[PDB]
Enzyme design. Structure first.
Site, short mmCIF file in Angstrom:
data_model
loop_
_atom_site.label_atom_id
_atom_site.label_comp_id
_atom_site.label_asym_id
_atom_site.label_seq_id
_atom_site.Cartn_x
_atom_site.Cartn_y
_atom_site.Cartn_z
N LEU A 100 0.82 -1.21 0.00
CA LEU A 100 0.00 0.00 0.00
C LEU A 100 0.85 1.26 0.00
CD1 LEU A 100 -2.74 -1.12 2.52
CD2 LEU A 100 -2.97 -1.05 0.05
N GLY A 101 1.96 1.22 0.72
CA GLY A 101 2.86 2.36 0.73
C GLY A 101 4.17 2.07 1.43
N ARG A 102 5.08 3.03 1.32
CA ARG A 102 6.36 2.95 1.98
C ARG A 102 6.68 4.33 2.53
NH1 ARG A 102 11.24 1.56 -1.83
NH2 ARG A 102 10.69 -0.61 -1.30
N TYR A 128 10.33 4.92 7.44
CA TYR A 128 10.47 4.03 8.59
C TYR A 128 9.81 2.66 8.44
CZ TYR A 128 12.01 8.31 11.02
OH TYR A 128 12.67 9.47 11.39
N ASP A 163 0.71 13.45 14.73
CA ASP A 163 0.72 13.33 13.26
C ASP A 163 -0.70 13.28 12.69
OD1 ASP A 163 2.00 13.35 10.75
OD2 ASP A 163 2.20 11.16 10.70
#
Ligand SMILES: O=C(O)c1cc2c(ccc3ccc4oc(C(=O)O)cc4c32)o1
EC number: 2.7.11.1
Length: 330
Positions: A44-46, A49, A155
């Protein structure tokens, strides 16, 4: 004596009464599940971290999300795990389902409940006035919960507020930047994401608190009701403050830094200028007017304050007239 100290006005001392183990995440002992329970399905994403995958729990055939960690500061691993465990089962808090060792990375992989999210950029374009109020209330439940548990998210942003619009379900995710609030503690200002950074971060004031999350929430609200995503669109962290000052005015910014005996980075000398405080009506036009009301603007106004001590708390925010029209559960 440089800066004047600051304290949260609510949940100030919650952690000090706790057993050390509650907040001393460095001493936490991770409980491990079985990696073979999980099959990765698609990336899904990177981030800097971690890598995040949609996956399946092959034991129950349920969809899950797997975050394979890789932080440079490895103590952050225990912090995120401890925070997730402390907050588990709270209103609108993403559930940590498992923690397993990934055999390829040899690093911890956090397993979370799946959310069938609507992409925020697409979704925000479709939100009605009622929806904005509804989902804002849902976010407030999550923030008042974590604040009450002595934890600031740090966040808050659209990506981290996962909404399954079909089923009107909301989850606050990615507690990797979250921290335990202790009175008088100086925190890293390199947190949040650019457009959502509070004035405290941007002026390098370290003794901040839960109220940081309320600035970020205000930024989200402004983007939603004005249909301008993001609302404060800085090119970098310095321009980010200038963008804010063009709305809130420079006089109140100087009052803020003067209150806390803070000096601006001399960087700001020849870029900040002199700006009046704008009335919120400035940002209303024929395309967003159906989302704006006096209650919306007043609520927004009370979130977006330079002085972190002046912002509405999550609980106070839930008391606002903006939410009178929202049917509460259940
Ligand atoms: O980074 C995390 O901790 C994280 C990400 C997510 C999570 C928990 C549930 C999720 C559900 C759907 C998602 O879609 C995406 C996406 O990127 O499309 C990310 C996610 C995440 O925790």
């Amino acid at each position: 004596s440089g800066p004047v100290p600051s304290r949260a006005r609510v949940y100030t001392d919650v952690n000090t009464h706790r057993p050390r183990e509650y907040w001393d995440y460095e001493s936490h002992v991770v409980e491990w599940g079985n990696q073979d329970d999980y099959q990765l399905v698609r990336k899904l994403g990177r981030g800097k971290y971690s890598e995040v995958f949609e996956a399946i729990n092959i034991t129950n055939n349920e969809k899950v999300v797997v975050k394979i960690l890789k932080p440079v500061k490895k103590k952050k691993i225990k912090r995120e795990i401890k925070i997730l465990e402390n907050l588990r089962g709270g209103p609108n808090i993403i559930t940590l389902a498992d923690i397993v060792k990934d055999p390829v990375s040899r690093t911890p992989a956090l397993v979370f409940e799946h959310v069938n999210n609507t992409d925020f950029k697409q979704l925000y374009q479709t939100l009605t006035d009622y929806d904005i109020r509804f989902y804002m209330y849902e976010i407030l439940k999550a923030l008042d919960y974590c604040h009450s548990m002595g934890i600031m998210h740090r966040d808050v942003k659209p990506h981290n507020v996962m909404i399954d619009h079909e089923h009107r379900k909301l989850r606050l995710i990615d507690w990797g930047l979250a921290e335990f609030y202790h009175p008088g503690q100086e925190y890293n200002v390199r947190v949040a994401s650019r457009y959502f950074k509070g004035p405290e971060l941007l002026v390098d004031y370290q003794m901040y608190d839960y109220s940081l999350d309320m600035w970020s929430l205000g930024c989200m609200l402004a983007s939603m009701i004005f249909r301008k995503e993001p609302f404060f669109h800085g090119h970098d962290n310095y321009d980010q403050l200038v963008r804010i000052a063009k709305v809130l005015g420079t006089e109140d910014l100087y009052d803020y830094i003067d209150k806390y005996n803070i000096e601006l980075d001399p960087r700001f000398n020849d870029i900040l200028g002199r700006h009046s405080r704008k009335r919120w009506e400035r940002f209303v036009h024929s395309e967003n007017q159906h989302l704006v009301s006096p209650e919306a603007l007043d609520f927004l106004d009370k979130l977006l304050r330079y002085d972190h001590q002046s912002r509405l708390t999550a609980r106070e925010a839930m008391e606002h007239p903006y939410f009178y029209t929202v049917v509460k559960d259940q």
